[PDB]
């Protein structure tokens, strides 16, 4: 029951994700090395991982049908506000409930709670993120649903600063309708039960995660010694 246009949207998003998410994580070797033993030994590595991820999220976003047709200012507002949320979403692909960590192919690139703690985060702030990853992983999303979810997250018409909210909403509605139809037509029960609602709830959960983790970014980067360990792109997109 998926229209020709809806199948096209999905085809475009899958291609976009595949070209911006390398499941082998080969590029991680180019990041400053992780250090597990300034007590924030993992800050350099995770700053590089996040900076790299921001580049990839932008690469994915530019491929969302209609996104590049919004004004440059709105594209910027949408990406600055969704970047950390999309990184959290895309990271679910490497996340494993086996031991509650992000497994990127090797021990050196396997990140757990302690590693994030070594980048400045309090254990209290890390817990909700782990819980979020577990809940998202349990939805067993089809890759089609996963890429649609990331796209919907990016083109959210309510982000403060958006000028042409109606245009952003037009794109999101097309993506939302595509997702709803895909679930009803291609996701078998019981996994499909209230799936759209559960997925959109994850986007609401992400607003809270964004708020708390952004506060942490501001506190950490407020100290010159820590900002010095970040990257130009992180400072530009997240703030400086």
């Amino acid at each position: 029951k998926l229209s020709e246009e809806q199948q096209h949207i999905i085809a475009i998003l899958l291609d976009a994700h595949h070209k911006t998410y390398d499941p082998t994580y080969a590029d991680f070797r180019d990041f400053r090395p992780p250090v597990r033993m300034s007590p924030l030994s993992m800050l350099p590595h995770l700053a590089d991982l996040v900076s790299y991820s921001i580049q990839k999220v932008i690469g994915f976003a530019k491929m969302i049908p209609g996104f590049r047709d919004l004004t440059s200012d709105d594209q910027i507002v949408l990406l600055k506000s969704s970047a950390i949320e999309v990184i959290m979403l895309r990271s679910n692909q490497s996340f494993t409930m086996d031991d509650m960590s992000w497994d990127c192919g090797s021990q050196d690139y396997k990140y757990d709670v302690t590693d994030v703690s070594k980048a400045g985060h309090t254990l209290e702030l890390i817990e909700p993120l782990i819980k979020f990853q577990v809940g998202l992983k349990k939805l067993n999303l089809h890759e089609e649903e996963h890429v649609l979810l990331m796209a919907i997250c990016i083109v959210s018409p309510d982000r403060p600063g958006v000028q042409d909210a109606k245009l952003v909403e037009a794109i999101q509605d097309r993506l939302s309708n595509t997702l709803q139809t895909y679930i009803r037509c291609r996701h078998p029960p019981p996994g499909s039960h209230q799936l759209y609602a559960k997925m959109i709830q994850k986007l609401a959960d992400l607003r809270s995660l964004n708020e708390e983790h952004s506060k942490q970014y501001r506190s950490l980067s407020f100290q010159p010694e820590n900002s010095m360990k970040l990257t130009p792109l992180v400072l530009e997109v997240f703030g400086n």
Binding site: I58, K62, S72, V237
Partner: peptide, 11 residues
């Protein structure tokens, strides 16, 4: 504040 790098990655 301008976002030169972000803008270039969008091109």
């Amino acid at each position: 504040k301008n976002h030169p790098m972000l803008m270039n990655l969008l091109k």
